[PDB]
Design an enzyme around this catalytic site. Structure first.
Site, PDB file in Angstrom:
ATOM      1  N   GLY A 236       0.805  -1.232   0.000  1.00 44.11           N
ATOM      2  CA  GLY A 236       0.000   0.000   0.000  1.00 44.11           C
ATOM      3  C   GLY A 236       0.833   1.274   0.000  1.00 44.11           C
ATOM      4  N   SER A 237       0.368   2.285   0.737  1.00 45.20           N
ATOM      5  CA  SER A 237       0.892   3.674   0.700  1.00 45.20           C
ATOM      6  C   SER A 237       2.384   3.742   1.041  1.00 45.20           C
ATOM      7  CB  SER A 237       0.139   4.558   1.631  1.00 45.20           C
ATOM      8  OG  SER A 237      -1.249   4.538   1.362  1.00 45.20           O
ATOM      9  N   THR A 238       2.955   2.702   1.649  1.00 43.79           N
ATOM     10  CA  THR A 238       4.378   2.696   2.064  1.00 43.79           C
ATOM     11  C   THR A 238       5.288   2.681   0.828  1.00 43.79           C
ATOM     12  OG1 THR A 238       4.534   0.341   2.250  1.00 43.79           O
ATOM     13  CG2 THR A 238       3.748   1.549   4.223  1.00 43.79           C
ATOM     14  N   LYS A 240       4.456   4.564  -1.989  1.00 38.97           N
ATOM     15  CA  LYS A 240       4.148   5.835  -2.695  1.00 38.97           C
ATOM     16  C   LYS A 240       5.384   6.733  -2.787  1.00 38.97           C
ATOM     17  CE  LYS A 240      -0.842   6.304  -2.155  1.00 38.97           C
ATOM     18  NZ  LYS A 240      -1.849   6.271  -1.084  1.00 38.97           N
ATOM     19  N   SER A 292      -2.469  10.401   1.922  1.00 37.75           N
ATOM     20  CA  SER A 292      -2.419   9.102   1.217  1.00 37.75           C
ATOM     21  C   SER A 292      -3.479   9.088   0.112  1.00 37.75           C
ATOM     22  CB  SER A 292      -2.577   7.935   2.174  1.00 37.75           C
ATOM     23  OG  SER A 292      -1.997   6.768   1.601  1.00 37.75           O
TER      24      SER A 292
END
Length: 489
Positions: A236-238, A240, A292
């Site tokens: 996920g967002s980690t 980005k 996020s």
């Protein structure tokens, strides 16, 4: 008539230490009593006394010896204390001969179970470093010629000492703080990796649940899972920040640039990209990370192409083999396309549509923290740092660091990840393994001159910014002080 055989002289397994020489695994003398049934069959009156002194039941004992009456070889009991080894040798029972052996002891026990692993019944590595450096640690058995009763040809070479990258002080801190986190959030399981961003060294690796490798009678496989190396999840967002890294290397984006994410959704023909929070119009690139915003990161990805994003994720090691040669290490999956459609482009950019381990994520965060210079992962003490691969421009890496510092510090930021004394940088996310939930935080500190990268995974806490982040805070504060890192605030 008479006969000449050989019996092999077991080797003394190499000592395993932490990076400071704290023993983590030690070969301790024990004795394996065996017997010659043929000769045992001549002293049946002694068997009940032998039996009792082997814990063995009287009749179960005698059944065994009778069944194997012809066999000139049989083990009685493997690896007793050398002193009980006398308790039996004090009976001087005919047919009872004895071997001198080594059994492993793990002084730190459950604290470092997974990273160290353990040996099997034959003093062979079966998990962790014990398996992975089995050759280095296992010596070379010697050989003796035995006159079969109706010179040593080469004496045994001892295994070699191995000093790990693990710092047992940071390992205790991580073990404790991840144990406490799991109980406070009532979670099933978790990993925490701490990495030296300059040397590639794993300073700490801990998983919950853990076990005592000194007592595996009631072992369960869930306890033995080295989660940090084998559980693969969608980051996920980690990831980005890697998407943003490509944005800034494109020539087409700078941090003060604005994206309109109103109304918190984006239709992608049939697909709809949907933000977790939808109270925004204009966001700067930092805002896109703070919120996020999957709409924000998707629009940037459409502008630069998936290829540029995929290329950064590959270069920082996501979905790639770590080269650590640990036993059940999972590689995850960084999938590729010729033609990246919008949906696949967007899902890569916001970190679904790949799978990674905690180790891989920490390694990538290490690269970014090391001003964009990848260094190979090590579980052994690094004395001579290898040359890095410059996978992200120092300037881009520097920019993305500051942005991640703002993610932790700025208003609306992940305030529970601040490390008191130091500026810290990082990013929360909410991973998928049906589809399981984990809380992630991934970061490094000090923000302006990084030393340490850290990943926290917490399985099904019954958000990343709420659950994983405070653990990152407590464990980073301790790691930095244990390493005498000077406060940068």
């Amino acid at each position: 008539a008479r006969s000449v055989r050989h019996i092999a002289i077991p080797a003394h397994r190499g000592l395993i230490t932490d990076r400071n020489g704290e023993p983590l695994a030690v070969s301790t003398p024990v004795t394996t009593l065996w017997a010659n049934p043929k000769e045992l069959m001549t002293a049946k009156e002694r068997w009940p006394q032998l039996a009792a002194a082997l814990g063995q039941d009287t009749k179960l004992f005698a059944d065994r010896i009778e069944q194997n009456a012809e066999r000139e070889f049989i083990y009685l009991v493997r690896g007793l204390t050398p002193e009980q080894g006398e308790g039996v040798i004090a009976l001087k029972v005919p047919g009872v001969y004895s071997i001198e052996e080594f059994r492993r002891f793990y002084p730190a026990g459950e604290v470092v179970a997974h990273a160290v692993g353990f040996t099997d019944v034959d003093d062979r590595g079966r998990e962790g470093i014990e398996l992975a450096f089995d050759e280095w640690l296992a010596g070379v058995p010697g050989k003796r010629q035995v006159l079969k009763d109706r010179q040593v040809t080469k004496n045994a070479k001892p295994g070699k000492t191995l000093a790990l990258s693990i710092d047992l002080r940071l390992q205790y801190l991580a073990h404790r703080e991840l144990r406490n986190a799991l109980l406070e959030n009532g979670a099933k399981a978790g990993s925490l990796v701490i990495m030296d961003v300059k040397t590639g060294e794993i300073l700490a690796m801990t998983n919950q649940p853990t076990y005592n490798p000194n007592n595996r009678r009631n072992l369960q496989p869930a306890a033995m899972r080295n989660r940090a190396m084998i559980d693969v999840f969608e980051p996920g967002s980690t990831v980005k920040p890697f998407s943003m890294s490509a944005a800034l290397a494109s020539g087409r984006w700078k941090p003060s640039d604005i994206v309109d994410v109103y109304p918190g959704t984006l239709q992608i023909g049939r697909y709809t990209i949907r933000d977790v929070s939808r109270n925004s119009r204009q966001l700067d690139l930092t805002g896109i990370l703070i919120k996020s915003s999957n709409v924000g990161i998707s629009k940037i990805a459409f502008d630069i192409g998936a290829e540029s994003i995929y290329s950064v994720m590959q270069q920082v090691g996501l979905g790639q083999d770590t080269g650590l040669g640990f036993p059940g290490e999972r590689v995850g999956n960084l999938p590729n396309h010729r033609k990246w459609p919008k949906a696949e482009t967007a899902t890569l950019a916001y970190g679904y549509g790949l799978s990674v381990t905690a180790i891989q994520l920490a390694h990538a965060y290490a690269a970014l923290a090391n001003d964009g210079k990848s260094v190979p992962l090590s579980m052994t003490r690094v004395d001579r740092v290898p040359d890095g691969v410059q996978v992200i421009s120092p300037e881009v890496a520097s920019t993305v660091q500051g942005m991640l510092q703002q993610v932790v510090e700025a208003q609306g930021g992940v305030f529970r990840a601040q490390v008191p004394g130091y500026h810290a940088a990082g990013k929360s996310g909410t991973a998928r393994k049906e589809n399981a939930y984990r809380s992630l935080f991934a970061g490094f500190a000090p923000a302006t001159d990084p030393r340490i990268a850290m990943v926290v995974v917490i399985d099904e806490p019954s958000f990343g910014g709420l659950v994983s982040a405070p653990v990152f805070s407590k464990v980073m504060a301790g790691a930095l002080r244990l390493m005498n890192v000077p406060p940068d605030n």
